[PDB]
Amino acid sequence: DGTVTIEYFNQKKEMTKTLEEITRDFEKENPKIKVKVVNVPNAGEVLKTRVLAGDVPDVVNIYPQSIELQEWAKAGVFEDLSNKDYLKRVKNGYAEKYAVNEKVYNVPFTANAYGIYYNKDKFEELGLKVPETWDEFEQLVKDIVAKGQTPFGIAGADAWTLNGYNQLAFATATGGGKEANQYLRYSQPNAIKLSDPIMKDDIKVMDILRINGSKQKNWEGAGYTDVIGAFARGDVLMTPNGSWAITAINEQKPNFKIGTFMIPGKEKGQSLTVGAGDLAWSISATTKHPKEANAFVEYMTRPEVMQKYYDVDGSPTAIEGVKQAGEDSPLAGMTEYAFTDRHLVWLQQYWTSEADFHTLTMNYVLTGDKQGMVNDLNAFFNPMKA
Ligand SMILES: OC[C@H]1O[C@H](OC[C@H]2O[C@H](OC[C@H]3O[C@H](O[C@]4(CO)O[C@H](CO)[C@@H](O)[C@@H]4O)[C@H](O)[C@@H](O)[C@@H]3O)[C@H](O)[C@@H](O)[C@H]2O)[C@H](O)[C@@H](O)[C@H]1O
């Protein structure tokens, strides 16, 4: 053979094409190395299965805030990257941010954010403005309905799309990420009640997606791809999603300027965003080819390589020498406070799972059962407290 085959386990499905191009560039420069890019459905569950078996892919796209990364890093599943030369290319101290036992196990090239995509053209046309408060967000939705347009595209079949929305609902209601987890995670069993002012505020924010005529027809069974199409064609004026979606929206070739805005707080200047490492790689500690795996990770840290990724993806990067877009970019509003205190880490950093949080979030948008949602939250968080 002479050549060596390593595996990269990808979870960035929106960026598959570009990542395969980068991989092909790496292979052209490293003839003795072949990289197998894996894009399997239910990737998180497949990864969990493979880690338990000890069949860890050479390079793994794992989110560095996840309970998986934390637990697997402690178990010695991943290579210690603390003293790698290429790690100096990571700024914002972003690699050290997700350190486990004060050791780096993941290279977070980019950070994802969450907000509301909006149609700039239609907003200007209808005389609408970006909301700065909850009340203004309520009124914005109502004004759009009154003008005979659909405010939101919601992927009712994909509950994960509203993960960031409800997390920011709690974040803005409490005052931040730590305050949100104090109410939800580190509270007493069955502490979350309907009568709680924080819970009332959460419902108020969630009820923005329940305003009369706020969602598109057949939203209940609509998917992530469907909603991307709906927004891109201009069928809906807004869609709540992460910064991961913009690349897919751009691919649909919209006939308008795209903007984003952060989910506002109760008052002006209380808006927040949520996210962590997006394109974030870890190396197997039991890789048969550690030199090749490190070489693949090193390649991605190069400024001319990340620039190629960034120009398609668009999410904020922590890599040195990468030219980032200005204030005219679609993600400008969502990613204005990237790598600051207003950019809090995913709340499931301190949870055992997140799937059920997605479910209860979307189930409320489907039903409007307030007590049911309160009940769902307690049923989700109680097992973690014991
Ligand atoms: O808020 C959602 C998500 O945000 C961070 O990951 C960034 C990630 O978002 C998108 O992938 C979402 C992904 O969700 C589902 O996949 C699973 C479960 O099947 O969920 C796990 C975490 O996302 C993952 O391990 C599993 O594969 C869903 O089935 C799948 O279709 C979706 O793609 C986006 O597509 C991707 O490019 C990234 O930007 C955060 O780290 C996550 O914990 C989560 O909160």
TrEMBL record:
Gene3D superfamilies: Periplasmic binding protein-like II. GO terms for biological process: transmembrane transport. InterPro entries: Bact_solute-bd_prot1, SBP, SBP_1_CS. Keywords: Cell membrane, Lipoprotein, Membrane, Palmitate, Signal, Transport. Transmembrane segments: none annotated. It comes from the Bacteria. SUPFAM superfamilies: Periplasmic binding protein-like II. This is Extracellular solute-binding protein. It comes from Streptococcus pneumoniae. The lineage of its organism: Bacteria, Bacillati, Bacillota, Bacilli, Lactobacillales. The gene is rafE.
